[PDB]
Amino acid sequence: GVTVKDVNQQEFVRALAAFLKKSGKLKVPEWVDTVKLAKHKELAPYDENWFYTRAASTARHLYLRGGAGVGSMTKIYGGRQRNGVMPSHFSRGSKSVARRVLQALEGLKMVEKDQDGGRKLTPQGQRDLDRIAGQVAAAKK
Amino acid sequence: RDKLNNLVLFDKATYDKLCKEVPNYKLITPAVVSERLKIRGSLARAALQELLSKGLIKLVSKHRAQVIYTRNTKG
Amino acid sequence: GRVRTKTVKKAARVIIEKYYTRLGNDFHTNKRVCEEIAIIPSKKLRNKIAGYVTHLMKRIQRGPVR
Amino acid sequence: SLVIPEKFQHILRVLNTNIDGRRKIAFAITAIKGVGRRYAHVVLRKADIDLTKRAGELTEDEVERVITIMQNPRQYKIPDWFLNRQKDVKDGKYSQVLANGLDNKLREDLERLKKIRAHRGLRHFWGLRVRGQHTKTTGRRGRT
Amino acid sequence: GPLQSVQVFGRKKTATAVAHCKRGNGLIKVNGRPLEMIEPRTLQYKLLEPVLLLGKERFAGVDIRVRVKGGGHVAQIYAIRQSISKALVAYYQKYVDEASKKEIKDILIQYDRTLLVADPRRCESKKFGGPGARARYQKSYR
Amino acid sequence: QPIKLARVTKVLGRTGSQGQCTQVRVEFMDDTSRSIIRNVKGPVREGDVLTLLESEREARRL
Amino acid sequence: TPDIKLFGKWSTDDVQINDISLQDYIAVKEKYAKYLPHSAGRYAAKRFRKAQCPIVERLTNSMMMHGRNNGKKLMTVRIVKHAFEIIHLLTGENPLQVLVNAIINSGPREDSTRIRRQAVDVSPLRRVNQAIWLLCTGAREAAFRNIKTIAECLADELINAAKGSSNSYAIKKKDELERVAKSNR
Amino acid sequence: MAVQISKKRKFVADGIFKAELNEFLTRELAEDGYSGVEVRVTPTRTEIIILATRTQN
Amino acid sequence: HRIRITLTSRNVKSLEKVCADLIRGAKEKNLKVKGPVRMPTKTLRITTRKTPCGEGSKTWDRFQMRIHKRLIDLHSPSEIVKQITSISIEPGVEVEVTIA
RNA sequence: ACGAGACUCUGGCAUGCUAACUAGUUACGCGACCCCGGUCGGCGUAACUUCUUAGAGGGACAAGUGGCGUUCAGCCACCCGAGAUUGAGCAAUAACAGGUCUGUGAUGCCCUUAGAUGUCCGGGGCUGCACGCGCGCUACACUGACUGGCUCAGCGUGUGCCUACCCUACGCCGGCAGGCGCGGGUAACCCGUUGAACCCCAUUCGUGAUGGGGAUCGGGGAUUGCAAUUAUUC
């Protein structure tokens, strides 16, 4: 048996996003295909069902350290703000795009409001996340 | 100067010269083909996945910055 | 540029002309004699001075120094 | 597929402006003034057209389906904060202006600020920086 | 039985990797995830230096857990290298003969001295009048 | 004209206007008897060998 | 394996250095075999400590040039890695052997200097540094503003320099320095 | 205390305190030979000694 | 009973002799003592131009004030404390007794 | 006698010493999950100080060896070792019509002192644009840009005597800037395990002033402020 840490997160994020295709229970907003994920971005994501990929990434990011609030994910998904003629700086990601995905994974129970604020994933939300790591660990065998 | 007007899509003349000539080159990169067939790099990149699907080229190493192919087994 | 100043050389000759018997030849023990027979304010001087008296021994058994 | 199709349009004369066909569809529309690399993607996402094709393989029966979204973005569920002309000063209608209206709507507001003799309008009449830049050291090229 | 645990640190520029040996089987993982699956994956053989030059059997009866903190990416990789190599030789001196330990350290120092001794290089302080520790601002005449 | 191999025997001193060249007492690996002086560029140790494009040029002693 | 070392997959053995003048300044064999050409460094501490650096590392360091690429060794190690199978899939020879043949055939023997300029021969180490120099700036001139990636232009030049194809940027610069030196001599 | 300022700010404050005494006393007790002060801490009591040449003056 | 005593001081040894002075009176009372907890020191950096005006080569200063802080907590009632607190205290050291 | 050096601080080495419920490790006992074991910044304890913090010490001296040198001062090389030149602060005699009276309740002299060169208020200006020069920032791309994914820092600072003004977690609303609630932190406690970029992995582009570059400029939306037009910033 394997947990998620012995599997490469590169092929582990979109493996869990494939599990979010069979569900289709994610309560996706409608402004999804017309939004720019951060003020420091300039284009919308190329792959259109990006909502299913990052909601998969916020899930595993809650696995390794819980209690993270929407302010923390704006730091997770931040990056260089290429300021044009002025020097670039780090800038946080968008809040609403992060506020919806954790509201979405509370829609279909995979995560709950931790005490002291924040969001930690329920024990059943950790049971199935190894079922995705077990099949890819079996995929390399 | 002299602006390169590469080809964005194959006409059947070049497409003929692809399914025949390139699988015999010792090195297949989207660069070495795009400079020899006078086509863009995206079409060159796109023109090596089917040859990998048809199995007429061998993928030796692909990377974000560099994707390399060669001939098949000679035997 | 490891050249000893006079205050290292001056103090190194005074102990040898006064404690020629208690100090030895190896650096470490006559390092330990120096803090007892001379109050040195720093540790580097304690090693700088002790470093020279050791050098003067293998000049003494080879003959007299002026 | 990678072989070249039939029914080509190397130059799709759209909105009285040429548009290259060798370019990808998401970026060929940017050749039109009033639509940039951002506003072009939401349109090609409003009309479910696949962005993996160049602008010279898409069927012409739906290129106007793209155009009607350019002219009419409101009923196609496009937000107000995407429009290059929000809350017009005359009609206050949230509209997107496209490459011929763009430049004529560009010398209306310029001449409107001149007849009222606004300072911001006179700075355009004289050929100076209007957003309050230091003109002492920069801006020399057109100025002989 | 006996708790043959050795907790050996390895430093780098700022990255500090402290390994934790014990009498287990041959598993080695830093921060819980295995050794070979560590980014950047360009430094793969770098963390395999102690395992390649010494063979797998030297780690067969020793398991290591490494916690790292500080520094940058490659600093952590270079810290983990001379953290688990220092931990293994520190295992073979507390519990078994040095006759084997002296014959395994010479394999490492002959390969690269950094597997055992830390590099005492740190970022020098910036001095005013310039953008760096040595570089100055462009002096202009007239 | 043949090229020859020359093994340095002792470094003499630095020369050149900017002190860029090095004078060396170099000896021919082909026959140790015939030995020459020769100006060289770049850093030179003691015991490394050179590739003279001609042997008959002797560098003036500084 | 305490017995053999492969540069990722390239065997360090059976690499002959024909030119005797440089087999003392080319760390390639039998104690300098490494899996990665990325090491801690310190080779620039004393004067001649640069000689015992593996050349593949010295090829890797001289690639981080021209501003933007400064301090990006993780990118150049990927470059020289990729270049090594490219030459192997374009020559069939051993990558290490081809690199050795190139720096031999690209290091100038003579060089003029201001002492009116006098022609003097170069030291072996300077010759090696100049060799790695020429075939690195050459590939930089080829990949610039060109669809051909930095990996291939690096690959072919040390292929063309290994045989002195006289269309290498290194060789055209090497004989030119040896022609000017042949003039004022 | 009332507003409870931090440890960094308090140590800076008494430095400003000792400074303003020295200047005030240097401008007033100089002709009587003022030569510096020193404060000694005590709960609810701060005694300050004026080291002066002519103590009767 | 669990009381905390804070010792903050600008000078190090004048703190060290007080941080060891409270220990002389506490083992005098033969009760369980907490070891002096060395807190990370705080340094106050102030860099300014040496020049009153803006002329000459640009040179700066490095005014610092490294502050030190030690913690010792004791399991003792209040009257055993306030007899020890009043013994041999130097002005350079500031004591903070926390009853809770 | 001063200056140099010494000295002060800093950097690196001490599984030795002193200590830690505002720092942790390691075990134990539960909890979660996957097939005895594995993972957890999930939860509480007993030992310990490797990791953290900072005190006291120790440590390096050209000390050893081999050459060179009057064999003196020393130099080179090597062995051993964490170092066989870390970095900075301090810094003499004499001097400059160097700068500063726009730092000062440091100041001589001179000028002004009520219709004021005093003080305060309103508005403007210090930014004004044929041109020249100095310090810089962003770039000219493919060793790249774009979009995802992944994964690591260390310096600091933070609620004000006058002072009316802090740093922010978490939860909601909004594309965004931001707004509305609730709490923490006078701080090794909370921000905060400071999930920083670069880099790394994977798409798209394809040598085209191109998805290089982002100057100029239009329209709209916020925030600070008594007040933003000559666009405060966003």
Tab-separated table of N, CA and C (backbone and C1' of nucleotides) in Angstrom, chain D residues 23-24 27 37 54 84 86-87 109 112 119-120 123-124 130-136 140 143-144, chain J residues 127-133 146 175 204-206 210-212 216-221 229-231:
chain	number	residue	atom	x	y	z
D	23	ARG	N	-2.014	32.210	-39.210
D	23	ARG	CA	-1.941	32.393	-37.771
D	23	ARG	C	-3.031	31.587	-37.081
D	24	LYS	N	-2.809	31.305	-35.804
D	24	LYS	CA	-3.804	30.583	-35.033
D	24	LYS	C	-5.018	31.466	-34.788
D	27	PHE	N	-5.259	34.191	-32.133
D	27	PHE	CA	-4.433	35.366	-32.315
D	27	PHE	C	-4.649	36.056	-33.648
D	37	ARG	N	-5.489	40.170	-27.060
D	37	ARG	CA	-5.264	38.759	-26.790
D	37	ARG	C	-6.149	38.231	-25.675
D	54	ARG	N	-5.683	26.705	-37.102
D	54	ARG	CA	-5.314	27.999	-37.644
D	54	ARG	C	-6.554	28.659	-38.231
D	84	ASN	N	-14.220	47.537	-23.932
D	84	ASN	CA	-13.304	48.660	-24.063
D	84	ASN	C	-14.027	49.994	-23.979
D	86	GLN	N	-17.049	51.164	-21.718
D	86	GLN	CA	-18.064	51.001	-20.692
D	86	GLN	C	-18.650	52.352	-20.322
D	87	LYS	N	-19.978	52.398	-20.206
D	87	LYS	CA	-20.700	53.603	-19.812
D	87	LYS	C	-20.309	54.798	-20.669
D	109	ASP	N	-14.112	61.850	-28.403
D	109	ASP	CA	-13.733	62.256	-27.061
D	109	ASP	C	-12.550	63.211	-27.065
D	112	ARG	N	-14.149	66.467	-28.076
D	112	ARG	CA	-15.048	66.884	-27.012
D	112	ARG	C	-14.308	67.576	-25.882
D	119	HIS	N	-7.980	71.255	-19.941
D	119	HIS	CA	-6.528	71.154	-20.002
D	119	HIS	C	-6.088	69.841	-20.623
D	120	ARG	N	-6.759	68.746	-20.277
D	120	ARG	CA	-6.410	67.453	-20.847
D	120	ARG	C	-6.635	67.435	-22.351
D	123	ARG	N	-3.739	69.507	-24.233
D	123	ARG	CA	-2.480	68.781	-24.312
D	123	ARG	C	-2.422	67.872	-25.529
D	124	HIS	N	-3.557	67.337	-25.971
D	124	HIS	CA	-3.586	66.614	-27.232
D	124	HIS	C	-3.501	67.548	-28.421
D	130	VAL	N	-0.164	63.764	-21.859
D	130	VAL	CA	-1.392	64.197	-21.203
D	130	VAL	C	-1.539	63.591	-19.813
D	131	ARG	N	-0.970	62.413	-19.572
D	131	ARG	CA	-1.159	61.747	-18.290
D	131	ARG	C	-0.194	62.266	-17.233
D	132	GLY	N	0.448	63.397	-17.502
D	132	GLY	CA	1.253	64.061	-16.499
D	132	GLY	C	2.657	63.515	-16.370
D	133	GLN	N	3.341	63.344	-17.493
D	133	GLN	CA	4.724	62.907	-17.499
D	133	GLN	C	5.645	64.115	-17.551
D	134	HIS	N	6.855	63.940	-17.031
D	134	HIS	CA	7.878	64.969	-17.126
D	134	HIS	C	8.349	65.076	-18.568
D	135	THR	N	8.032	66.189	-19.216
D	135	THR	CA	8.426	66.392	-20.601
D	135	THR	C	9.808	67.005	-20.742
D	136	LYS	N	10.506	67.248	-19.632
D	136	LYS	CA	11.786	67.941	-19.700
D	136	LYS	C	12.861	67.094	-20.360
D	140	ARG	N	11.373	63.106	-27.347
D	140	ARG	CA	12.141	63.908	-28.284
D	140	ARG	C	12.001	63.475	-29.732
D	143	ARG	N	9.521	65.240	-31.916
D	143	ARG	CA	9.745	66.641	-31.624
D	143	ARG	C	11.095	67.044	-32.218
D	144	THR	N	11.266	66.711	-33.496
D	144	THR	CA	12.499	66.921	-34.256
D	144	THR	C	13.736	66.410	-33.518
J	127	U	P	11.382	70.177	-9.984
J	127	U	O5'	10.249	69.442	-10.822
J	127	U	C5'	9.780	70.007	-12.037
J	127	U	C4'	9.048	69.005	-12.891
J	127	U	C3'	8.235	69.618	-14.029
J	127	U	O3'	8.270	68.749	-15.153
J	127	U	C1'	6.817	68.354	-12.648
J	128	G	P	8.963	69.240	-16.511
J	128	G	O5'	8.018	70.416	-17.013
J	128	G	C5'	6.694	70.151	-17.443
J	128	G	C4'	6.011	71.410	-17.901
J	128	G	C3'	6.758	72.212	-18.947
J	128	G	O3'	6.702	71.710	-20.274
J	128	G	C1'	6.150	73.654	-17.232
J	129	C	P	5.387	71.056	-20.915
J	129	C	O5'	5.866	70.717	-22.394
J	129	C	C5'	6.064	71.752	-23.350
J	129	C	C4'	7.444	71.735	-23.972
J	129	C	C3'	7.996	70.380	-24.416
J	129	C	O3'	8.785	70.548	-25.599
J	129	C	C1'	9.515	71.400	-22.953
J	130	A	P	8.361	71.569	-26.769
J	130	A	O5'	9.373	71.240	-27.950
J	130	A	C5'	10.775	71.182	-27.728
J	130	A	C4'	11.549	71.480	-28.989
J	130	A	C3'	12.902	70.803	-29.120
J	130	A	O3'	12.812	69.469	-29.578
J	130	A	C1'	13.100	73.087	-29.688
J	131	C	P	13.519	68.286	-28.758
J	131	C	O5'	14.961	68.859	-28.417
J	131	C	C5'	15.979	68.894	-29.402
J	131	C	C4'	17.236	69.520	-28.861
J	131	C	C3'	18.062	68.653	-27.928
J	131	C	O3'	18.890	67.734	-28.609
J	131	C	C1'	17.799	70.790	-26.977
J	132	G	P	19.386	66.405	-27.861
J	132	G	O5'	20.533	66.916	-26.887
J	132	G	C5'	21.751	67.420	-27.407
J	132	G	C4'	22.710	67.789	-26.309
J	132	G	C3'	22.977	66.719	-25.270
J	132	G	O3'	23.908	65.746	-25.698
J	132	G	C1'	22.540	68.752	-24.184
J	133	C	P	23.776	64.235	-25.186
J	133	C	O5'	24.247	64.303	-23.670
J	133	C	C5'	25.585	64.639	-23.346
J	133	C	C4'	25.769	64.843	-21.866
J	133	C	C3'	25.438	63.658	-20.979
J	133	C	O3'	26.461	62.683	-20.938
J	133	C	C1'	24.464	65.599	-20.078
J	146	C	P	5.806	35.705	-19.661
J	146	C	O5'	4.615	34.858	-20.288
J	146	C	C5'	3.589	35.500	-21.027
J	146	C	C4'	2.651	34.505	-21.660
J	146	C	C3'	1.906	33.588	-20.707
J	146	C	O3'	0.764	34.204	-20.145
J	146	C	C1'	2.796	32.328	-22.498
J	175	G	P	-17.734	38.209	-9.735
J	175	G	O5'	-16.146	38.256	-9.744
J	175	G	C5'	-15.402	37.085	-10.035
J	175	G	C4'	-14.109	37.395	-10.745
J	175	G	C3'	-13.059	38.159	-9.962
J	175	G	O3'	-12.354	37.340	-9.045
J	175	G	C1'	-13.184	38.979	-12.181
J	204	U	P	1.836	21.278	-27.659
J	204	U	O5'	1.443	22.763	-28.066
J	204	U	C5'	0.098	23.197	-27.967
J	204	U	C4'	0.007	24.696	-27.900
J	204	U	C3'	0.853	25.457	-28.901
J	204	U	O3'	0.294	25.490	-30.198
J	204	U	C1'	1.104	26.429	-26.773
J	205	C	P	1.226	25.166	-31.460
J	205	C	O5'	2.062	26.503	-31.664
J	205	C	C5'	1.400	27.706	-32.011
J	205	C	C4'	2.148	28.923	-31.538
J	205	C	C3'	3.381	29.313	-32.329
J	205	C	O3'	3.044	30.036	-33.498
J	205	C	C1'	3.826	29.457	-30.005
J	206	G	P	3.129	29.344	-34.940
J	206	G	O5'	4.628	29.606	-35.387
J	206	G	C5'	5.213	30.891	-35.228
J	206	G	C4'	6.715	30.823	-35.277
J	206	G	C3'	7.290	30.101	-36.490
J	206	G	O3'	8.501	30.729	-36.887
J	206	G	C1'	8.006	29.026	-34.515
J	210	U	P	4.805	42.257	-35.753
J	210	U	O5'	4.902	40.807	-35.110
J	210	U	C5'	4.049	39.765	-35.548
J	210	U	C4'	4.245	38.519	-34.728
J	210	U	C3'	4.135	38.696	-33.225
J	210	U	O3'	2.792	38.693	-32.781
J	210	U	C1'	6.052	37.408	-33.743
J	211	G	P	2.234	39.879	-31.857
J	211	G	O5'	2.264	39.264	-30.392
J	211	G	C5'	1.695	37.990	-30.120
J	211	G	C4'	2.116	37.488	-28.763
J	211	G	C3'	3.581	37.081	-28.645
J	211	G	O3'	4.021	37.345	-27.316
J	211	G	C1'	2.225	35.246	-28.113
J	212	G	P	4.448	38.827	-26.878
J	212	G	O5'	5.997	38.694	-26.562
J	212	G	C5'	6.814	37.771	-27.261
J	212	G	C4'	8.246	38.226	-27.260
J	212	G	C3'	8.524	39.467	-26.432
J	212	G	O3'	8.705	39.167	-25.061
J	212	G	C1'	9.521	39.695	-28.558
J	216	U	P	4.286	56.244	-21.182
J	216	U	O5'	3.337	56.788	-22.335
J	216	U	C5'	3.796	57.783	-23.233
J	216	U	C4'	2.954	57.833	-24.480
J	216	U	C3'	1.472	58.076	-24.270
J	216	U	O3'	1.165	59.443	-24.078
J	216	U	C1'	1.775	56.297	-25.792
J	217	C	P	0.151	59.877	-22.918
J	217	C	O5'	-1.263	59.379	-23.446
J	217	C	C5'	-1.837	59.949	-24.611
J	217	C	C4'	-2.963	59.105	-25.148
J	217	C	C3'	-4.106	58.825	-24.191
J	217	C	O3'	-5.022	59.897	-24.094
J	217	C	C1'	-3.472	56.825	-25.265
J	218	G	P	-6.048	59.960	-22.863
J	218	G	O5'	-7.262	59.047	-23.332
J	218	G	C5'	-7.983	59.360	-24.510
J	218	G	C4'	-9.045	58.333	-24.798
J	218	G	C3'	-9.994	58.019	-23.658
J	218	G	O3'	-11.017	58.983	-23.514
J	218	G	C1'	-9.262	56.010	-24.644
J	219	G	P	-11.608	59.308	-22.061
J	219	G	O5'	-12.452	58.013	-21.694
J	219	G	C5'	-13.576	57.640	-22.470
J	219	G	C4'	-14.118	56.300	-22.050
J	219	G	C3'	-14.304	56.087	-20.562
J	219	G	O3'	-15.452	56.719	-20.035
J	219	G	C1'	-13.274	54.193	-21.486
J	220	G	P	-15.450	57.203	-18.506
J	220	G	O5'	-15.508	55.844	-17.677
J	220	G	C5'	-16.672	55.034	-17.715
J	220	G	C4'	-16.424	53.653	-17.166
J	220	G	C3'	-16.153	53.556	-15.677
J	220	G	O3'	-17.329	53.634	-14.895
J	220	G	C1'	-14.610	52.213	-16.845
J	221	G	P	-17.257	54.211	-13.401
J	221	G	O5'	-16.567	53.045	-12.571
J	221	G	C5'	-17.159	51.758	-12.502
J	221	G	C4'	-16.278	50.790	-11.760
J	221	G	C3'	-15.855	51.220	-10.371
J	221	G	O3'	-16.863	51.004	-9.403
J	221	G	C1'	-13.976	50.413	-11.540
J	229	U	P	-8.142	63.780	-10.657
J	229	U	O5'	-7.573	64.613	-11.888
J	229	U	C5'	-8.334	64.778	-13.078
J	229	U	C4'	-8.018	66.082	-13.773
J	229	U	C3'	-6.536	66.376	-13.991
J	229	U	O3'	-6.372	67.078	-15.220
J	229	U	C1'	-7.503	68.110	-12.728
J	230	U	P	-5.287	66.583	-16.294
J	230	U	O5'	-3.889	66.944	-15.628
J	230	U	C5'	-2.687	66.361	-16.113
J	230	U	C4'	-1.474	66.857	-15.367
J	230	U	C3'	-1.503	66.667	-13.853
J	230	U	O3'	-0.186	66.375	-13.394
J	230	U	C1'	-1.248	68.958	-14.357
J	231	A	P	0.075	65.157	-12.380
J	231	A	O5'	-1.254	64.281	-12.451
J	231	A	C5'	-1.393	63.207	-13.374
J	231	A	C4'	-2.851	62.923	-13.625
J	231	A	C3'	-3.519	61.915	-12.713
J	231	A	O3'	-3.794	62.426	-11.423
J	231	A	C1'	-4.246	61.603	-14.945
